[PDB]
């Protein structure tokens, strides 16, 4: 991301798991966060992990 840190304790350092975006605000929280840092409503959805080519 535009904020290019060296390596936080997040998925920035080569992870296939994306971040979670609040379905209320659209606030994307770290995979470490338990809930939204906007409304604290625990209403987050992790972005489409997607697939490589086939299922598995
Ligand atoms: Zn929210």
UniProtKB/Swiss-Prot annotation:
SMART domains: Ribosomal_L40e. The keyword Ribonucleoprotein applies. Pfam families: Ribosomal_L40e (PF01020). The keyword Chloroplast does not apply. The gene is rpl40e. Belongs to the eukaryotic ribosomal protein eL40 family. One of its GO terms (cellular component) is ribonucleoprotein complex. One of its GO terms (biological process) is translation. This is Large ribosomal subunit protein eL40. Keywords: Ribonucleoprotein, Ribosomal protein. GO terms for molecular function: structural constituent of ribosome. It comes from the Archaea. HAMAP family: Ribosomal_eL40 (MF_00788).
């Amino acid at each position: 991301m535009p904020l290019t840190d060296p390596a936080k304790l997040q998925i920035v350092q080569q992870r296939v798991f994306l971040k979670k975006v609040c379905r209320k605000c659209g606030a994307l929280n770290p995979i470490r966060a338990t809930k939204c840092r906007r409304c604290h409503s625990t209403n987050l959805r992790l972005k489409k992990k997607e697939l490589p080519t086939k299922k598995g």
